[PDB]
Design a protein around this nucleic acid. Structure first.
Ligand SMILES: [Mg+2]
Ligand SMILES: [Mg+2]
Ligand SMILES: [Mg+2]
Ligand SMILES: [Mg+2]
Ligand SMILES: [Mg+2]
Ligand SMILES: [Mg+2]
Ligand SMILES: [Mg+2]
Ligand SMILES: [Mg+2]
Ligand SMILES: [Mg+2]
Ligand SMILES: [Mg+2]
Ligand SMILES: [Mg+2]
Ligand SMILES: [Mg+2]
Ligand SMILES: [Mg+2]
Ligand SMILES: [Mg+2]
Ligand SMILES: [Mg+2]
Ligand SMILES: [Mg+2]
Ligand SMILES: [Mg+2]
Ligand SMILES: [Mg+2]
Ligand SMILES: [Mg+2]
Ligand SMILES: [Mg+2]
Ligand SMILES: [Mg+2]
Ligand SMILES: [Mg+2]
Ligand SMILES: [Mg+2]
Ligand SMILES: [Mg+2]
Ligand SMILES: [Mg+2]
Ligand SMILES: [Mg+2]
Ligand SMILES: [Mg+2]
Ligand SMILES: [Mg+2]
Ligand SMILES: [Mg+2]
Ligand SMILES: [Mg+2]
Ligand SMILES: [Mg+2]
Ligand SMILES: [Mg+2]
Ligand SMILES: [Mg+2]
Ligand SMILES: [Mg+2]
Ligand SMILES: [Mg+2]
Ligand SMILES: [Mg+2]
Ligand SMILES: [Mg+2]
Ligand SMILES: [Mg+2]
Ligand SMILES: [Mg+2]
Ligand SMILES: [Mg+2]
Ligand SMILES: [Mg+2]
Ligand SMILES: [Mg+2]
Ligand SMILES: [Mg+2]
Ligand SMILES: [Mg+2]
Ligand SMILES: [Mg+2]
Ligand SMILES: [Mg+2]
Ligand SMILES: [Mg+2]
Ligand SMILES: [Mg+2]
Ligand SMILES: [Mg+2]
Ligand SMILES: [Mg+2]
Ligand SMILES: [Mg+2]
Ligand SMILES: [Mg+2]
Ligand SMILES: [Mg+2]
Ligand SMILES: [Mg+2]
Ligand SMILES: [Mg+2]
Ligand SMILES: [Mg+2]
Ligand SMILES: [Mg+2]
Ligand SMILES: [Mg+2]
Ligand SMILES: [Mg+2]
Ligand SMILES: [Mg+2]
Ligand SMILES: [Mg+2]
Ligand SMILES: [Mg+2]
Ligand SMILES: [Mg+2]
Ligand SMILES: [Mg+2]
Ligand SMILES: [Mg+2]
Ligand SMILES: [Mg+2]
Ligand SMILES: [Mg+2]
Ligand SMILES: [Mg+2]
Ligand SMILES: [Mg+2]
Ligand SMILES: [Mg+2]
Ligand SMILES: [Mg+2]
Ligand SMILES: [Mg+2]
Ligand SMILES: [Mg+2]
Ligand SMILES: [Mg+2]
Ligand SMILES: [Mg+2]
Ligand SMILES: [Mg+2]
Ligand SMILES: [Mg+2]
Ligand SMILES: [Mg+2]
Ligand SMILES: [Mg+2]
Ligand SMILES: [Mg+2]
Ligand SMILES: [Mg+2]
Ligand SMILES: [Mg+2]
Ligand SMILES: [Mg+2]
Ligand SMILES: [Mg+2]
Ligand SMILES: [Mg+2]
Ligand SMILES: [Mg+2]
Ligand SMILES: [Mg+2]
Ligand SMILES: [Mg+2]
Ligand SMILES: [Mg+2]
Ligand SMILES: [Mg+2]
Ligand SMILES: [Mg+2]
Ligand SMILES: [Mg+2]
Ligand SMILES: [Mg+2]
Ligand SMILES: [Mg+2]
Ligand SMILES: [Mg+2]
Ligand SMILES: [Mg+2]
Ligand SMILES: [Mg+2]
Ligand SMILES: [Mg+2]
Ligand SMILES: [Mg+2]
Ligand SMILES: [Mg+2]
Ligand SMILES: [Mg+2]
Ligand SMILES: [Mg+2]
Ligand SMILES: [Mg+2]
Ligand SMILES: [Mg+2]
Ligand SMILES: [Zn+2]
Lengths: 100, 99, 62, 208, 84
RNA sequence: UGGAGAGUUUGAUCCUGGCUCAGGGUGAACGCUGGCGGCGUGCCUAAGACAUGCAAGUCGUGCGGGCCGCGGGGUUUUACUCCGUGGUCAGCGGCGGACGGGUGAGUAACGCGUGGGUGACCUACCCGGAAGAGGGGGACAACCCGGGGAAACUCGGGCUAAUCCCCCAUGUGGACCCGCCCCUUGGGGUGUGUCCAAAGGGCUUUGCCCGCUUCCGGAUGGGCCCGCGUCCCAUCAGCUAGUUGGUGGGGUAAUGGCCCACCAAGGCGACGACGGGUAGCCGGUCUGAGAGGAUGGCCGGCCACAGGGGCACUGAGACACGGGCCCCACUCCUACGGGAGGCAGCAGUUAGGAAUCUUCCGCAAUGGGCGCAAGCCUGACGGAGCGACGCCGCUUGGAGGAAGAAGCCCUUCGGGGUGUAAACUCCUGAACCCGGGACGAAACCCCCGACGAGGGGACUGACGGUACCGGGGUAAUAGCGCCGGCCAACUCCGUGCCAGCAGCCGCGGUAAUACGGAGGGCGCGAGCGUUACCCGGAUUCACUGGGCGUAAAGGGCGUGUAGGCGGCCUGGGGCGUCCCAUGUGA
């Protein structure tokens, strides 16, 4: 079946495109502690309707463009800019780790 | 100090020079319709476009063009001409177009 | 490189083969020399452990 | 190949009769009723408390030297035996006895194991009616071991079979003395044959 | 085209061909599509041949292709007798 | 159903802790030694350079010529074209040359592994279903003539064949534009317009067969995309301009920023981006109680490369090892007047190296291509050849034989040991000699039945007269390591911190079981040792399974970011987690 994922939107600065940030919990293969992950996808949004904070879903699709092989499915609960907070801080703090 | 299958190449040239010449035609000829359908002449153009359609679909009897190729050509061809003539022009001969 | 046994025939431009394995008493030397190879002749009159010392089996009686 | 040379010396290196000779290793001594002490210049000298290792080494050599079989072929068995389940130790001697040259010694066709090899080797032995010149051959239930026609004579066979009258065969064997045929009935448990060898010590020696 | 042929096994001076369906452009001892029996050109076994006729003719209904030597067995195996 | 420990820090103790050994493994190598067979396996280094040969051709059931034959058309001088059969050699056309073989360089990446997507696609030969195969033209080799060359050869002028090329017709059907219908990412269908096909050759011919043509399915083989997994250095911390998204085109079997325009300014990174280093990945393999650790060599799947790079052609499929063009380097021929070549194919040569083979036989078998079929090619493959490289099997013999010779050892000079060992007496008797001798082969093909089914008949063996069978038939290679402790095996002499051993602890200073020889013993055996490397022991990176007061180890102290963790009751959700079922895990 076509892969289906649930993630949130953090970008829409692309004409017709949004960036969705996904997560996945799974045990460590050697230490078994339930850990989280992350992967930013480039979601295809022709009728640019979805915005930031939109906890939405996506489906495996034919190649739209290089780097862009995911269409948007449905909304799951918009108005959640709180998750977009801890994500924004992370990249925010990456200017404090500079080896300079 | 070789093999006689060097033919294949010695032949493959003809096939090359054959469907190369066949193709240079389609290009310059697919132009005629484009230029015309761009400038009103629906009648004279929609006879070059039928022809074009020929050379294209005709080509599919060999190893020149094949598969969805001739289909992709027209698909973009007899769709581009209809859009051009759509601006003024006014149809004259559907001879190739199920309008 | 260490030269094992009693008496050798190695001059300046002698060819040779390395073995590997240190001496200890001799700091800064972690390689032995294989006997009876190239320009390294085995120990002459060797009767015991001939596998090393590259000495071949001698003749018994006649 | 196999071992060759002084054997009565082994008879007394382990400090036990093992009847590797025919009459002699079975007559008044394996050269031991004379000298029941270890070979070599240091024979009549007291021994040092043998270490737990040397004990298992000795108790092993003993067993292997009994069947007179190389350390090659030997350990191969223990591993095959050890591979199995149950007890292995018991299973071990099972695979030892199943040898062709062994069956022959038991079935009195020969007096010594080393004599039994020469037989099998030269082709003067049979199995279900086949020329089996391979002492390594492993035997199973119901296998018939007889002599070949070209050999069903020889002034040496009649003697061996004849001596076998006035003697019995293992609870896992059966000999048709008058016919030159025998049978391997079953695999002889540890009980079916007693020996100066504590297997369990041989098991330990292999788990270095 | 897809063929049905012999694939050497066993050892040297001791054949044990596997009869199987695979592409003709594969190595004779390569990855096959489906195994359907074997054969011992030495006759040193009661089971010196075996075929799954139900599964064999199927590839024939889809358009297989046996060797000139694989035929022999296939025909001499009772898979060609049209019957009625 | 699976787990052993030992040596070394002190005068001694306990602990910590490192070094060391016993174990198994290897595409190995080196020393000493070396008899047989079988089955494996053998350039790990210079993906350095290669003489010679071989490794892909085939069809006269597509065409015309070549001479040669060949039975032989028929007549104005060495035969004639007439025939057919051929035999064919080249030329034209068809199919394969994209499979099969080698290599591991490159690649840290959708390359691979595992699970899915394509309503975004191709697929020759093969199978099944429907429809067709109507006519009309033409070209280039061959061939004759001409030029240049040493060659490669080359150009030039003029004829000719077809399953070669062209045009028209026919359309069962297919293709595309628009509307419409259903579905719904370009899937199916509908209507209308326009476009699209063909090939004949052989006959026990007048009927079959071998093919041609378009379509819808089958099958097989793919391409593309996606989720998860995939090493070392943060002493590499910031990276990016086609860069990220868009629009519209070009492009392909088709998605895609793949490519190109323009629009916007995005895209990536401590969940480690970018960068350097190493590496082909998996099935597996080695070790380990396990979890793990190490590994990817033979065999199998995938990828990549074919002297270094670039490129496109042909084609169903290649950007193609034994095909082409260009640049580079290297090398070879030459009458130098100019051209040729690509072993990481099979063998072999050369260099490099501690080191890795026959310039063998055969298409008999199996597989592959071509063909109606005989039949043809096949360094794929089947075998043989060389190397104790490995595992396995086998031999150098067996019984008897002394209170136990000689010799050599010790010795308290009484004696002890080598030692049933030998000798010696009988017994068998591997090798060798003679005869016999294969399984591996059956089909294709041929006759009968219709070439279907069936039955019957016939052909062919490289290995090789080899395995094996009979009988004759000779007592017939034994070497290597160790014997201070770990660790199995002790004495004499020589030596005197010298010569020397040595994995660790340590041995040698005139009494050395530790050096060197001898006697003797322990351990293995066509092997025994050594070196190197991987796992083990090491629980010594500790997930299973450890520590930080003094043994190595708590940040100098706070505040706080991200992050990890979180109290009692109840409900929705059921992500984690758990059961069952099913597919996949060849
Ligand atoms: Mg056609
Ligand atoms: Mg093409
Ligand atoms: Mg058990
Ligand atoms: Mg063990
Ligand atoms: Mg393939
Ligand atoms: Mg047949
Ligand atoms: Mg200790
Ligand atoms: Mg101290
Ligand atoms: Mg001390
Ligand atoms: Mg320690
Ligand atoms: Mg080791
Ligand atoms: Mg390697
Ligand atoms: Mg080389
Ligand atoms: Mg070089
Ligand atoms: Mg012919
Ligand atoms: Mg190829
Ligand atoms: Mg290949
Ligand atoms: Mg090779
Ligand atoms: Mg190979
Ligand atoms: Mg990199
Ligand atoms: Mg990286
Ligand atoms: Mg001329
Ligand atoms: Mg001309
Ligand atoms: Mg004509
Ligand atoms: Mg037409
Ligand atoms: Mg549609
Ligand atoms: Mg026609
Ligand atoms: Mg003809
Ligand atoms: Mg591919
Ligand atoms: Mg586009
Ligand atoms: Mg292509
Ligand atoms: Mg695009
Ligand atoms: Mg597009
Ligand atoms: Mg642009
Ligand atoms: Mg940090
Ligand atoms: Mg991440
Ligand atoms: Mg890191
Ligand atoms: Mg790099
Ligand atoms: Mg590499
Ligand atoms: Mg693995
Ligand atoms: Mg394994
Ligand atoms: Mg285990
Ligand atoms: Mg494991
Ligand atoms: Mg790996
Ligand atoms: Mg290799
Ligand atoms: Mg391989
Ligand atoms: Mg090269
Ligand atoms: Mg393909
Ligand atoms: Mg090629
Ligand atoms: Mg090329
Ligand atoms: Mg390629
Ligand atoms: Mg080549
Ligand atoms: Mg050459
Ligand atoms: Mg070669
Ligand atoms: Mg070579
Ligand atoms: Mg050299
Ligand atoms: Mg070979
Ligand atoms: Mg062949
Ligand atoms: Mg064949
Ligand atoms: Mg044929
Ligand atoms: Mg040839
Ligand atoms: Mg050949
Ligand atoms: Mg071969
Ligand atoms: Mg051998
Ligand atoms: Mg050697
Ligand atoms: Mg004595
Ligand atoms: Mg004596
Ligand atoms: Mg004797
Ligand atoms: Mg005799
Ligand atoms: Mg004969
Ligand atoms: Mg034939
Ligand atoms: Mg028949
Ligand atoms: Mg027959
Ligand atoms: Mg013979
Ligand atoms: Mg004989
Ligand atoms: Mg003798
Ligand atoms: Mg030893
Ligand atoms: Mg030891
Ligand atoms: Mg000891
Ligand atoms: Mg000293
Ligand atoms: Mg001193
Ligand atoms: Mg020594
Ligand atoms: Mg002294
Ligand atoms: Mg002293
Ligand atoms: Mg020592
Ligand atoms: Mg000594
Ligand atoms: Mg000794
Ligand atoms: Mg001794
Ligand atoms: Mg070795
Ligand atoms: Mg172990
Ligand atoms: Mg832990
Ligand atoms: Mg600790
Ligand atoms: Mg603490
Ligand atoms: Mg201190
Ligand atoms: Mg401290
Ligand atoms: Mg503190
Ligand atoms: Mg602190
Ligand atoms: Mg500080
Ligand atoms: Mg602090
Ligand atoms: Mg917090
Ligand atoms: Mg929390
Ligand atoms: Mg809680
Ligand atoms: Mg809840
Ligand atoms: Mg399951
Ligand atoms: Zn005795």
């Amino acid at each position: 079946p076509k892969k289906v994922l649930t993630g949130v939107v953090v970008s829409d600065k692309m004409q017709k495109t949004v960036t969705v940030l996904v997560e996945r919990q799974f045990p460590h293969p050697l230490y078994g502690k339930v850990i989280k992950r992350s992967k930013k996808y480039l979601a295809h949004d022709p009728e640019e309707k979805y915005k930031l904070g939109d906890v939405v879903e996506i489906i495996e699709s034919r190649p739209i463009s290089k780097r862009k092989r995911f269409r948007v499915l449905r909304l799951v609960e918009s108005g959640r800019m709180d998750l977009v907070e801890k994500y924004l801080i992370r990249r925010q703090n990456y200017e404090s780790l500079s080896k300079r | 100090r070789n093999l006689s299958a060097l033919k294949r190449h010695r032949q493959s040239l003809k096939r090359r020079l054959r469907n190369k010449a066949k193709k240079s035609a389609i290009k310059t000829l697919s132009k005629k319709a484009i230029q015309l359908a761009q400038e009103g002449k629906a009648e004279e153009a929609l006879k070059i476009m039928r022809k074009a359609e020929s050379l294209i679909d005709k080509a599919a009897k060999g190893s020149t063009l094949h598969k969805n190729a001739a289909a992709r050509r027209k698909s973009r061809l007899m769709r581009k001409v209809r859009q051009l003539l759509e601006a003024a022009g006014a149809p004259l001969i559907g001879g190739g177009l199920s309008a | 490189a260490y030269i094992p046994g009693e008496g050798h025939n190695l001059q300046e431009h002698s060819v040779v083969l390395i073995r590997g394995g240190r001496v200890k008493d001799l700091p800064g030397v972690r390689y032995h020399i294989v006997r009876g190879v190239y320009d390294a002749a085995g120990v002459k009159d060797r009767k015991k452990s001939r596998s090393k010392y590259g000495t071949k089996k001698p003749k018994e009686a006649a | 190949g196999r071992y060759i040379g002084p054997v009565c010396r082994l008879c007394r290196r382990e400090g036990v009769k093992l009847y590797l000779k025919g009459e002699r290793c079975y007559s008044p001594k394996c050269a031991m009723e004379r000298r029941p002490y270890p070979p070599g210049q240091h024979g009549q000298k007291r021994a040092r408390r043998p270490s737990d290792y040397a004990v298992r080494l000795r108790e092993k050599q003993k067993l292997r030297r009994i069947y007179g079989i190389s350390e090659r072929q030997f350990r191969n068995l223990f591993e095959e035996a050890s591979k199995k389940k149950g007890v292995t130790g018991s299973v071990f001697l099972g695979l030892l006895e199943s040898r062709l040259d062994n069956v022959v010694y038991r079935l009195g066709f020969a007096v010594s194991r080393r004599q039994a090899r020469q037989l099998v080797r030269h082709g003067h032995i049979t199995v279900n009616g086949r020329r089996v010149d391979l002492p390594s051959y492993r035997v199973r239930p119901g296998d018939e071991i007889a002599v070949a026609e070209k050999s069903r004579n020889l002034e040496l066979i009649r003697q061996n079979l004849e001596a076998m009258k006035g003697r019995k065969v293992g609870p896992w064997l059966s000999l048709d003395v008058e016919g030159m045929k025998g049978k391997f009935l079953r695999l002889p448990d540890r009980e079916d044959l007693a020996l100066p060898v504590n297997e369990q010590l041989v098991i330990e020696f292999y788990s270095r | 085209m897809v063929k049905i042929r012999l694939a050497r096994f066993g050892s040297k001076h001791n054949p044990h061909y596997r009869i199987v369906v695979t592409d003709a452009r594969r190595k004779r001892d390569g990855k096959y599509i489906e195994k359907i029996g074997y054969y011992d050109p030495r006759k040193t076994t009661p089971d010196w041949l075996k075929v799954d006729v139900e599964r064999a003719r199927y590839w024939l209904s889809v358009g297989a292709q046996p060797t000139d030597t694989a035929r022999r067995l296939l025909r001499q195996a009772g898979v060609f007798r049209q019957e009625a």
